[PDB]
Amino acid sequence: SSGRFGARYGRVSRRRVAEIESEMNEDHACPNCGEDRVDRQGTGIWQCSYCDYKFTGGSYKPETPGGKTVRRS
Amino acid sequence: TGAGTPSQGKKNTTTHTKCRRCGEKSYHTKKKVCSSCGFGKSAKRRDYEWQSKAGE
């Protein structure tokens, strides 16, 4: 996904951007319904194209490992 | 770019203008203060002892 970076920057810098942007562009399950229609609107801002539910999540993930710990207690 | 002749070409800004108080072309239209009589800065007229030789 880091083909835009060309022959520049190096492995680790463009491998970590490719991995993070791959998981960001993925089909995510919505907290309102159950559909795989959540897209990123900006830094930390997520929204479902189905029910128009705009929510807060991680910067690049819609759910962080720490955000899932909150539900437990 | 040279600091001399080619840098003089950009000089079309008006700063020092005719003062309402003293009549000298020293009223800075951006600072709103006169460099000659001190209009805009002080009620008292700008004067200094160094404007003349010490014993005069």
Binding site: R16, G44, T56, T69 | -
Partner: protein, 237 residues
């Protein structure tokens, strides 16, 4: 010599100031008398230029439209409650006394009613541990055990925008854009690359500091550079 960069900072000139006129809101907790009967609906989720994390727009029962420090999971339509008898749900603000032990909390107050000081950055959280009639022990994001007044308010959940530090900036331009939204002079020229006149580490035929880097706490501004009062340096040992 000449005053160092750290001394130019304090003067508070344009170059060193934060673009305050471009900032949205000072995210503080709402002021309630007692009774808890203050709740609101989340209207929008906005980007906050001050902290690079998202912020939630909430419209309260008494007609007050204020931006609040958004925890993770808070979305449009959701109802948030602020007060003593508030529900123990993520996104609600209640004093540390009413919040159960072992629950991740954010935007914690130092002194009761200050509006929140601790655990506000992207994805961080404070952990409430021990309870008492006098003290509420909270474990801050640095790992420090902070003894606080149980009357200090806090919001349940971790702060939104988690994992921001995970992705590299890759290029200088990305750093440039972030820095233009902060109160920092960037790029950073090393003192060792400067002249003797400009910095304690300046000068020489080759680049190296002129004395050891570990400076005393008692050092005056102009000399306090490098490793400030270091207990140790290095990785090993």
């Amino acid at each position: 010599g000449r005053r160092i960069q750290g001394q130019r900072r304090g003067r508070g000139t344009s170059t060193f100031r934060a673009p305050s006129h471009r900032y949205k809101a000072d995210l503080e907790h709402r002021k309630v008398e007692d009774g808890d009967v203050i709740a609101g609906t989340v209207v929008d989720i906005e980007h906050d230029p001050a902290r690079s994390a998202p912020v939630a727009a909430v419209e309260f029962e008494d007609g007050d439209r204020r931006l609040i420090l958004a925890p993770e999971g808070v979305g449009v339509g959701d109802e948030l409650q602020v007060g003593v008898s508030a529900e123990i749900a993520p996104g609600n603000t209640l004093p540390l006394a009413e919040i159960p032990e072992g629950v991740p909390v954010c935007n914690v107050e130092s002194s009761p009613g200050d509006g929140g000081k601790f655990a506000r950055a992207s994805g961080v959280n404070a952990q409430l541990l021990t309870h008492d009639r006098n003290v509420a022990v909270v474990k801050l994001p640095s790992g420090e055990m902070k003894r606080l007044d149980p009357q200090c308010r806090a919001t349940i959940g971790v702060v939104a925008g988690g994992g921001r530090t995970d992705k590299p900036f890759v290029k200088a331009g990305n750093k440039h854009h972030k820095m233009k939204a902060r109160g920092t002079k960037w790029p950073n020229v090393r003192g060792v690359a400067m002249n003797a006149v400009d910095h304690p580490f300046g000068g020489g035929g080759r680049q190296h500091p002129g004395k050891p880097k570990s400076i005393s706490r008692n050092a005056p501004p102009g000399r306090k550079v490098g490793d400030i009062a270091s207990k140790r340096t290095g990785r090993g040992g």
